[PDB]
């Protein structure tokens, strides 16, 4: 029997299954483990298989695999072709029609990895919730993982969903992510966006806080229940050097949590904005001033010119479905100004 509330009732197979799940082993399965483990395992397996064997010849026109002669810095799992629009690319769907070889060739492995990884992230967050309940702690750790979940959703799901197709989502690789970064710079002027500016600050300040807290706690130690470092000395030092310093352990160890989460959430909102080509691309006033005055020039104007160069020179191969052919006389060049 199990005591639910004041009354005590008979057990059931559900109770037995729950008892088995929460058994204390090396690996804590828990209820969430039924969703986290298969999904995460298949996401990792899909990425590794795609990098090792699958190619991107028919989707992007590239060669992205170890079998075709790529390093760890160049292999990737590439997105499907733009002609697939926003198809979920089920292996049994109307595109592959159950043919594994052509399912892999069409690029469905990217969708496999992305979807199973999203559900793995959900499972991991649920697991973080569960362990906290088992140990009876406030689940602040799970609330912090909301930032990476939001970043993943904004970048890999919301962004391509608002664009032409999956073809414009990041591909799971190193060089591919660098390509994505340069693509946002050239086309979206992502650096100038206010929300990225508020995410960069978050990450850099988080690293700053990590370094300073590590250094301070390790320098005000007591010589050898009770804390191992002197709050008074650290407060005095950082108040006479910098000007202000923490005086509350709770506030400090909550500020450390607050900074990165807010930064990443802000950047995610910015990427959501970009998903609709809703760019913070230009300042109209300076564009007008430069157009009317050929001798007016700032660093922003030079950045705009560089973005033009990136777009024109990369669009030929980065977007094969447009079949663009730019003669050498129309490609932007510096000496043509």
């Amino acid at each position: 029997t199990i005591a639910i509330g004041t009354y005590q009732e008979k057990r059931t197979w559900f109770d037995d299954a729950d008892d088995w799940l929460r058994q204390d082993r090396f690996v804590f399965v828990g209820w969430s483990g039924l969703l986290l483990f298969p999904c995460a395992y298949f996401a990792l397996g899909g990425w590794l298989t795609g990098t090792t064997f699958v190619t991107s010849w028919y989707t992007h026109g590239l060669a992205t695999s170890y079998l075709e002669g790529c390093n760890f810095l160049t292999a990737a799992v590439s997105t499907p072709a733009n002609s697939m629009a926003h198809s979920l690319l089920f292996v049994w769907g109307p595109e592959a029609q159950g043919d594994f070889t052509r399912w892999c060739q069409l690029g469905g492995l990217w969708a496999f990895v992305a979807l199973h990884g999203a559900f793995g992230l959900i499972g991991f967050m649920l697991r973080q919730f569960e362990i906290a309940r088992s140990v009876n702690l406030r689940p602040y750790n799970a609330i912090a993982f909301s930032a990476p979940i939001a970043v993943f959703v904004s970048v890999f799901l919301i962004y391509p969903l608002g664009q032409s197709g999956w073809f414009f989502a990041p591909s799971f690789g190193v060089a591919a992510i660098f390509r994505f970064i340069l693509f946002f710079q050239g086309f979206h002027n992502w650096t100038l966006n206010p929300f990225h500016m508020m995410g960069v600050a978050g990450v850099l300040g988080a690293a700053l806080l990590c370094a300073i807290h590590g250094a301070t706690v390790e320098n005000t130690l007591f010589e050898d229940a009770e804390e191992t470092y002197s709050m008074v000395t650290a407060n005095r030092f950082w108040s006479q050097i910098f000007g202000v310093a923490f005086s509350n352990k709770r506030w400090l160890h909550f500020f450390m949590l607050l900074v990165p989460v807010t930064g990443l959430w802000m950047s995610a909102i910015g990427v959501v904005g970009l998903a609709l080509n809703l760019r913070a691309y230009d300042f109209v006033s300076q564009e007008i001033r430069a157009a009317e005055d050929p001798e007016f020039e700032t660093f922003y104007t030079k950045n705009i010119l560089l973005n033009e160069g990136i777009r024109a020179w990369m669009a030929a191969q980065d977007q094969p479905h447009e079949r663009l052919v730019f003669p050498e006389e129309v490609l932007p060049r510096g000496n043509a100004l």
């Binding site: 010589e223 050898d224 002197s230 008074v232 005095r236 108040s239 006479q240």
Partner: peptide, 17 residues
């Protein structure tokens, strides 16, 4: 170098800031 002695700490003997 080993740390703060925890008994007569230099900061405790300073006027509050």
């Amino acid at each position: 170098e080993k740390g703060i002695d925890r008994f007569d700490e230099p900061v405790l003997s300073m006027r509050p800031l």
